[PDB]
Ligand SMILES: Nc1ncnc2c1ncn2[C@@H]1O[C@H](COP(=O)(O)OP(=O)(O)O)[C@@H](O)[C@H]1O
């Protein structure tokens with residue numbers, strides 16, 4: 001009755017920026033540091049498409065796992081740690097299932113991974 | 119956007135996060151009443167393109183390179199002494215896609231396209247016919263680069279011994295003259311379609327005329343599949359529809375055949391669900407059409423015709 | 424659950440409509456109950472409802488008489504409901520329709536009305552138009568009034584009055600003297616294809632306005648002379664309620680050059696104005712023969728004009744061109760070229776079954792003698808076509824007239840419909856016409 005109302009669509013509720021401006025640098029710091037990069041094993045690069053508003057973080061090492069990315073997301077940001085979601089590649093739109101699956105097996109090599117809250 | 123047996127064009131009027139944005143599942147979509155106007159430099163995706171031609175790649179490739187320089191780099195031949203092709207002869211049975219190809223090549227290269235139809239020309243009285251002929255070449259040169267397409271050339275210039283009178287042979291003569299006076303700097307390429315060599319008058323092949331020939335025959339199963347997929351892009355096919363199967367029982371059919379074959383299927387679908395399901399009116403519901411799906415049964419029916 | 428689809432009739436009887444047993448079960452109807460039909464323009468009709476196994480559950484059979492009384496064409500939907508309230512009426516007032524009774528003078532009651540309702544218990548509603556065959560013609564009567572309004576059953580004690588001058592035909596009352604599918608016999612498979620071909624373009628025009636699908640435009644009819652190709656193209660038009668325009672080959676080829684091409688164009692223009700429309704080129708081969716048939720500078724220019732008109736057509740126009748010829752070879756290859764006459768239907772000589780039906784169609788208005796075995800005539804007119812059997816009946820009739828009438832009545836002023844109603848055609852006359 002005074003305008004500006006957001007509709008109540010069937011899409012899953014959203015998680016905004018729970019981390020303060022300062023907190024998010026330390027939140028990437030963990031992720032960037034947090035997991036293993038052994039230079040003597042050939043690399044790969046991932047670009048995450050979070051639903052947070054269109055937030056994208058990249059990086060990684062040689063052969064790891066899809067679940068390790070799911071771990072990076074949580075490490076890179078607290079809020080999502082409780083939120084349920086899934087992973088993907090767009091334009092064939094394959095749902096990254098079998099969380100363990102290694103990057104080699106999923107063709108997830110240097111390829112963009114989208115995040116969708118269930 | 120394709121569907122409901124058609125394709126609608128939509129112009130992004132405004133995006134929230136300004137210049138560009140990714141349409142996420144939470145993105146609010148507004149499409150408030152009104153259909154906007156098509157501007158000048160905005161062609162219709164309903165125009166013919168190379169994606170509307172299937173079963174021709176080899177031939178479509180030859181033609182592309184032939185016209186590539188003359189139509190895309192006119193200036194070149196202005197400063198060159200090399201001679202580009204002028205006339206291209208497209209032979210093959212009817213409904214093979216020659217007209218389609220010629221029109222597709224013109225648009226796809228932004229060239230002016232002028233159409234001459236054999237019967238049209240021959241329906242006129244003799245002097246009028248010539249008049250029209252030179253008019254086509256005249257208008258073509260004014261808007262060059264251009265492609266003049268003579269559809270049903272054999273209707274105008276039949277073989278040496280199909281000549282029947284001062285009027286018949288007077289027109290072919292006119293067409294030959296026009297071809298010899300057609301200079302390079304003009305930037306014109308005249309394409310003509312016929313059923314086969316013998317059909318035409320041998321003189322249209324003299325070196326400065328229709329010197330280049332391209333055979334566009336009947337499609338093979340692979341080719342036929344391509345076409346079927348093109349003429350069903352705008353409809354909803356049941357999951358039991360096997361186009362490849364269709365293409366296999368289609369030897370001998372040409373593009374026009376497949377195109378019609380589809381229409382039959384789609385009509386057989388409508389007749390079934392439209393007839394009894396009160397889906398008729400002095401206008402159509404986009405949704406009603408969008409829901410309707412052509413089953414493999416419909417194609418088995420179209421074939422049995 | 425009443426709404427059904429109007430299909431053709433099996434029982435040519437005016438008062439009866441048919442359905443599938445199952446359907447009668449759903450509507451709780453019985454082998455004789457009088458039903459009340461509802462169609463377009465707030466119109467209604469009263470009929471008897473029988474059972475038919477060849478009738479599809481969702482459809483209802485009925486003749487053009489009823490179909491017209493309802494303002495419906497084959498394909499529309501009507502609402503059927505039980506009518507257990509119909510009485511055994513008192514007095515009914517009927518009146519013929521001028522154009523149907525022109526030339527015949529005399530008692531139309533004892534000649535038509537009487538035999539028609541006679542022990543029939545035919546139900547009738549006010550405003551309906553029925554047809555009575557006899558005296559070598561079919562008279563149409565409008566039911567101006569039935570004492571028990573608006574409908575009653577005509578029982579043997581019902582009084583029928585024919586008081587006064589015949590009435591005019593209202594613009595929207597199509598004559599049953601017009602060509603309709605029930606006038607074509609022996610072309611079951613072909614008539615079926617033609618129907619489904621024109622069905623959507625002609626019955627559902629607005630469709631091809633929001634759809635990219637491409638309907639049929641030209642449809643070629645193959646068959647020897649007298650096969651009934653003109654009959655079919657006309658009936659289709661009438662039946663679908665489409666405007667029918669005719670183009671006769673020789674009619675065009677008789678014109679001074681130019682005037683011939685001028686008339687081809689005008690033919691399509693007028694046909695495009697009154698769409699949905701059917702242009703029917705009768706004797707195409709006379710206009711368009713090519714590649715060995717001549718290049719006589721006017722003959723070819725005309726064929727070319729005709730090819731141009733076929734290309735110029737566009738679905739927006741809602742026009743279907745039908746053409747007829749003896750065989751493919753006659754026509755010029757270009758006419759079959761995709762985008763023109765892309766559809767073709769063969770209509771050859773009828774078989775034993777066919778010829779029989781044809782014979783039945785061309786006697787429906789005459790009094791055949793019990794000795795007349797149409798099945799016999801059919802079983803010895805093998806090669807013959809519709810046109811032949813038709814002419815055959817006419818000669819039989821004329822014979823019959825020449826025998827019993829021309830002599831024993833060499834006096835004029837016997838245009839009376841009673842005389843014609845009593846004159847019978849014997850199997851002996853059909854035996855004579857055969858030997859001709
Ligand atoms: N090779 C093809 N691929 C896809 N569609 C085709 C092809 N050939 C023909 N068609 C379809 O059939 C119609 C036949 O067109 P057209 O080019 O005029 O035939 P032609 O010039 O060979 O006589 C086309 O408009 C198109 O819709």
Ligand SMILES: Nc1ncnc2c1ncn2[C@@H]1O[C@H](COP(=O)(O)OP(=O)(O)O)[C@@H](O)[C@H]1O
Pocket residue numbers: 606607608609610646647648649650651652653654655747781784808809810811813
């Ligand atoms: N199938 C048929 N059933 C009943 N009568 C027919 C049939 N075919 C032809 N006739 C009769 O013979 C005449 C032949 O008519 P028409 O259609 O003009 O022949 P066509 O076009 O084949 O030369 C018809 O007007 C009709 O009276």
